[PDB]
Design a protein around this ligand. Structure first.
Ligand SMILES: CCCCCCCCCCCCCC(=O)CSCCNC(=O)CCNC(=O)[C@H](O)C(C)(C)COP(=O)(O)OP(=O)(O)OC[C@H]1O[C@@H](n2cnc3c(N)ncnc32)[C@H](O)[C@@H]1OP(=O)(O)O
Ligand SMILES: COc1cccc(CC(=N)NC(=O)c2cccnc2OC2CCNCC2)c1
Ligand SMILES: [Cl-]
Ligand SMILES: [Cl-]
Ligand SMILES: [Cl-]
Ligand SMILES: [Mg+2]
Length: 385
């Protein structure tokens, strides 16, 4: 790979490493006054569009672009199918900017063919807290691939982020790019085993028959933490304390305000699930996971894999293993077929004993315009969407 676009940007080259003491921008003393005022040029017949994700129709257009053209697994059997209600939640966090929800239209048909987005958050990297954009949902239509549209989307969103005096960003990808700060394998825990077999997500052998696989993955419908219950507004201060305290141990994490705790954790059916254990008026344990279905490409019987993704889990009154066993059960009680997680935070410690299987790839975490030592994924304390 020559990385002819990425090598023009303030990111590390592919072999560039840094001492753990280095933790600073590539380019400092940036000036909002000098940022370009002009939108980047698109090829003829295409135009920028400011998407209004709060408008059901614009939001449907983004949904249809991603449903048809977003990320596939390595085996090209599944494509992520974020819901319209999920996109609303993901893109309207506190102080979000509408103008960072950027579309590209093909003028002749008036149809969205490209998109990129970001939201603002405070990110603590190696004990320094920096205002960053979290970038996600970069997508170019499958019919327009390899035409160098993605660099235009990237440069245009960078410009619009720079107008707010923000000069760093965080993002993830399954592809390798210059240059990860951390790389975390993903793992899955089967819930609806027969379905996962039928769709080719999981497999059997002469050793593990269908009935034996159903038994192996069976889960007891009883919580280890009996009073774990859906979070409500009254729990926002206690979750802000519990999760904020927990996250300070890591080398990379979001620094949530109370308003951000309410947005990111209060439950939305089919989008975000958060459960809490309240003891003596204090929130002492929390489980959370988000819903990200995959479309099952060319399957006669099933169109959709219902999948929960581990978000933030903290226990002070149980073992982590007991807490993640309850997360699995709570996902099963909400009709999910599989529970997915990354080897970040303390999650690796439970994967063997809770019968997770290793997936076939990894998610890379990246920073823009930031130099720092890379680190093992146990030190990652942020889960992106
Ligand atoms: C201070 C604020 C800063 C804000 C901005 C921060 C940075 C944010 C960066 C964005 C973070 C997004 C995070 C996120 O959304 C989560 S990762 C998921 C990204 N989306 C998909 O994979 C959906 C399906 N694929 C596509 O739509 C296209 O294949 C895309 C659009 C990915 C590339 O379209 P294309 O038609 O295939 O390709 P060209 O247009 O010809 O462009 C080729 C250039 O694109 C580089 N490329 C490929 N995939 C990338 C990826 N995932 N990130 C970054 N760069 C990626 C590639 O290395 C090459 O540059 P190089 O020549 O130097 O190698
Ligand atoms: C099963 O359907 C899939 C459809 C598309 C891709 C993948 C593999 C994959 N790339 N999985 C992950 O990236 C992943 C695995 C575990 C936890 N989080 C993840 O990704 C999240 C966070 C980053 N953005 C996408 C969703 C699987
Ligand atoms: Cl199978
Ligand atoms: Cl129970
Ligand atoms: Cl390390
Ligand atoms: Mg292109």
């Amino acid at each position: 790979m020559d990385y002819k676009f990425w090598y023009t940007q303030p990111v590390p080259k592919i072999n560039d490493e840094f001492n753990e003491s280095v933790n600073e921008p590539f380019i400092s003393d940036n000036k909002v006054e000098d940022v370009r005022k002009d939108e980047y040029k698109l090829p003829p017949g295409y135009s920028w569009y400011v998407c209004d994700v709060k408008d059901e129709k614009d939001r449907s257009e983004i949904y249809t672009l991603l449903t048809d053209n977003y990320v596939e697994d390595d085996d090209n059997i599944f494509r992520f199918n974020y819901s319209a209600e999920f996109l609303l939640w993901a893109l309207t966090s506190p102080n979000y900017l509408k103008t960072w929800h950027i579309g590209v239209k093909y003028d002749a048909s008036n149809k969205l063919i490209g998109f990129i987005s970001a939201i603002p958050t405070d990110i603590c990297i190696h004990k320094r807290t920096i205002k960053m954009a979290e970038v996600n949902f970069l997508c170019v239509h499958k019919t327009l691939r390899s035409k160098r549209l993605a660099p235009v989307l990237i440069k245009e969103i960078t410009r619009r982020i720079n107008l707010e005096n923000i000069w760093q960003a965080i993002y993830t990808a399954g592809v390798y790019l210059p240059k990860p700060v951390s790389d975390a394998r993903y793992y899955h825990r089967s819930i609806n085993v027969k379905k996962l077999i039928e769709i080719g997500f999981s497999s059997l052998n002469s050793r593990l028959t269908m009935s034996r696989a159903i038994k192996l993955y069976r889960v007891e419908d009883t919580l280890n933490i009996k009073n774990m219950r859906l979070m409500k507004k009254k729990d926002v201060e206690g979750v802000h304390k519990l999760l904020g305290s927990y996250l300070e141990q890591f080398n990379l994490y979001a620094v949530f305000t109370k308003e951000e705790i309410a947005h990111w954790f209060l439950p939305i059916e089919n989008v975000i699930y958060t459960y809490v254990n309240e003891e003596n008026g204090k929130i002492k344990d929390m489980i959370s996971f988000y819903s990200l279905p995959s479309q099952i490409l060319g399957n006669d019987k099933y169109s959709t894999l219902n999948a929960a993704y581990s978000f933030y889990n903290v226990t002070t009154t149980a073992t982590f293993k007991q807490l993640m066993q309850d997360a699995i059960l709570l996902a099963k009680r909400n009709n999910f077929d599989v529970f997915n997680a990354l080897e970040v935070m303390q999650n690796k410690s439970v994967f063997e004993d809770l019968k997770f299987g290793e997936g076939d790839g990894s998610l890379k975490y990246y920073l823009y315009n930031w130099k720092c030592a890379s680190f093992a994924p146990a030190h990652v304390g942020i889960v992106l969407l």
